Amino acid sequence: MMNEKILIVDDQYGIRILLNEVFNKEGYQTFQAANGLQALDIVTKERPDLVLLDMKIPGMDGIEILKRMKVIDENIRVIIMTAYGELDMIQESKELGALTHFAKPFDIDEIRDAVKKYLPLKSN
Protein backbone atom coordinates (compact mmCIF):
# COMPACT_ATOMS: atom_id res chain seq x y z
CA MET A 1 0.00 0.00 0.00
CA MET A 2 2.80 2.46 -0.86
CA ASN A 3 4.15 1.67 -4.35
CA GLU A 4 3.62 5.22 -5.67
CA LYS A 5 7.26 5.76 -6.71
CA ILE A 6 8.28 7.31 -10.05
CA LEU A 7 11.49 8.32 -11.86
CA ILE A 8 11.50 11.42 -14.10
CA VAL A 9 14.53 11.09 -16.40
CA ASP A 10 15.10 14.52 -17.98
CA ASP A 11 18.32 16.54 -18.36
CA GLN A 12 16.73 19.65 -19.91
CA TYR A 13 15.38 21.96 -17.18
CA GLY A 14 11.59 22.46 -17.30
CA ILE A 15 10.36 18.85 -17.43
CA ARG A 16 11.82 17.66 -14.11
CA ILE A 17 10.13 20.72 -12.57
CA LEU A 18 6.74 20.87 -14.33
CA LEU A 19 6.25 17.08 -14.20
CA ASN A 20 7.34 17.36 -10.55
CA GLU A 21 4.85 19.91 -9.16
CA VAL A 22 2.23 18.03 -11.22
CA PHE A 23 3.02 14.64 -9.63
CA ASN A 24 3.69 16.50 -6.36
CA LYS A 25 0.15 17.75 -5.63
CA GLU A 26 -1.61 14.87 -7.43
CA GLY A 27 0.08 12.58 -4.87
CA TYR A 28 3.14 10.84 -6.35
CA GLN A 29 6.77 10.40 -5.25
CA THR A 30 8.60 11.13 -8.53
CA PHE A 31 12.40 11.52 -8.62
CA GLN A 32 14.82 13.24 -11.02
CA ALA A 33 17.43 11.70 -13.35
CA ALA A 34 19.13 12.18 -16.74
CA ASN A 35 22.66 10.72 -16.64
CA GLY A 36 20.93 7.32 -16.97
CA LEU A 37 22.91 5.81 -14.07
CA GLN A 38 20.91 7.97 -11.63
CA ALA A 39 17.61 6.60 -13.00
CA LEU A 40 18.69 2.94 -12.72
CA ASP A 41 20.02 3.58 -9.20
CA ILE A 42 16.76 5.13 -7.93
CA VAL A 43 15.02 2.24 -9.72
CA THR A 44 17.00 -0.39 -7.77
CA LYS A 45 16.69 1.54 -4.49
CA GLU A 46 12.93 2.22 -4.62
CA ARG A 47 11.87 0.18 -7.68
CA PRO A 48 9.08 2.43 -8.98
CA ASP A 49 6.41 1.34 -11.48
CA LEU A 50 6.41 4.46 -13.68
CA VAL A 51 9.57 5.71 -15.43
CA LEU A 52 9.52 8.69 -17.81
CA LEU A 53 12.36 8.13 -20.31
CA ASP A 54 13.24 11.03 -22.64
CA MET A 55 15.31 10.55 -25.83
CA LYS A 56 16.29 14.24 -25.63
CA ILE A 57 19.06 13.59 -23.07
CA PRO A 58 21.97 14.95 -25.12
CA GLY A 59 24.62 12.58 -23.71
CA MET A 60 23.66 8.94 -24.39
CA ASP A 61 20.72 7.09 -25.98
CA GLY A 62 18.31 5.91 -23.26
CA ILE A 63 17.72 2.73 -25.30
CA GLU A 64 20.11 0.83 -23.01
CA ILE A 65 18.40 2.15 -19.85
CA LEU A 66 15.09 0.54 -20.87
CA LYS A 67 17.00 -2.75 -21.28
CA ARG A 68 18.22 -2.63 -17.66
CA MET A 69 14.62 -1.96 -16.57
CA LYS A 70 13.51 -5.07 -18.49
CA VAL A 71 16.34 -7.09 -16.91
CA ILE A 72 15.53 -6.02 -13.33
CA ASP A 73 11.72 -6.22 -13.60
CA GLU A 74 9.35 -7.23 -16.42
CA ASN A 75 6.38 -5.40 -14.84
CA ILE A 76 8.04 -1.98 -15.26
CA ARG A 77 6.31 0.82 -17.20
CA VAL A 78 8.09 3.56 -19.18
CA ILE A 79 6.82 6.40 -21.40
CA ILE A 80 8.70 8.15 -24.23
CA MET A 81 8.64 11.96 -24.01
CA THR A 82 9.93 12.40 -27.58
CA ALA A 83 7.50 11.16 -30.27
CA TYR A 84 8.13 14.22 -32.47
CA GLY A 85 11.49 13.17 -33.95
CA GLU A 86 12.59 9.69 -35.10
CA LEU A 87 11.01 6.23 -34.71
CA ASP A 88 13.61 3.43 -34.81
CA MET A 89 13.54 1.33 -31.62
CA ILE A 90 10.37 3.18 -30.58
CA GLN A 91 7.99 0.79 -32.39
CA GLU A 92 9.52 -2.37 -30.87
CA SER A 93 10.09 -0.43 -27.63
CA LYS A 94 6.29 -0.26 -27.36
CA GLU A 95 5.45 -3.98 -27.15
CA LEU A 96 8.63 -4.15 -25.04
CA GLY A 97 7.54 -1.93 -22.13
CA ALA A 98 6.66 1.54 -23.47
CA LEU A 99 3.18 2.37 -22.12
CA THR A 100 2.64 5.56 -24.14
CA HIS A 101 4.88 7.92 -26.15
CA PHE A 102 4.57 11.63 -25.30
CA ALA A 103 6.35 14.24 -27.45
CA LYS A 104 7.09 17.98 -27.31
CA PRO A 105 5.51 20.23 -26.80
CA PHE A 106 3.32 18.01 -24.60
CA ASP A 107 0.45 18.94 -22.26
CA ILE A 108 0.85 18.40 -18.49
CA ASP A 109 -2.80 17.27 -18.70
CA GLU A 110 -2.05 14.39 -21.11
CA ILE A 111 0.98 13.36 -19.02
CA ARG A 112 -0.86 13.21 -15.67
CA ASP A 113 -3.86 11.69 -17.48
CA ALA A 114 -1.91 8.72 -18.88
CA VAL A 115 -0.10 8.37 -15.54
CA LYS A 116 -3.46 8.17 -13.72
CA LYS A 117 -4.95 5.54 -16.06
CA TYR A 118 -1.77 3.45 -15.79
CA LEU A 119 -1.05 3.69 -12.04
CA PRO A 120 -4.35 3.74 -10.12
CA LEU A 121 -4.35 5.81 -6.91
CA LYS A 122 -6.01 4.71 -3.65
CA SER A 123 -9.83 4.94 -3.59
CA ASN A 124 -10.44 8.51 -4.81
CATH code: domain of residue 44: 3.40.50.2300
Q: Is 47 left (phi over 0), alpha (psi -120 to 50) or beta?
A: left
Give the domain range for residue 87.
Answer: 1-124
- In 3D space, the residue among 45, 118, 48 whose CA is nearest the CA of residue 76 turns out to be 48
What's the structural domain count of the chain?
1
Expressed in percent and rounded to 5, the helix, strand and coil fractions of the chain are 40, 15, 45
Question: Which segments within the chain are labelled E, that is strand?
Answer: 5-9, 29-33, 50-53, 77-80
- Residues 6 or more apart whose CB falls under 8 angstroms from that of 64 comprise 36
Is position 54 annotated in a ligand binding site?
yes
Is position 56 annotated in a ligand binding site?
yes
Q: Is 32 left (phi over 0), alpha (psi -120 to 50) or beta?
A: beta
CB 23 within 8 A of CB 115: yes
Give the C-alpha separation, 87 to 29, whole Å: 30
Is position 94 annotated in a ligand binding site?
no
| 36-43 LR contacts (CB < 8 Å, sep 24+) | 36/9, 36/60, 36/62, 36/64, 36/65, 39/7, 39/9, 39/65, 40/65, 40/68, 40/69, 40/72, 42/7, 43/7, 43/68, 43/69, 43/72, 43/76
Is position 73 annotated in a ligand binding site?
no
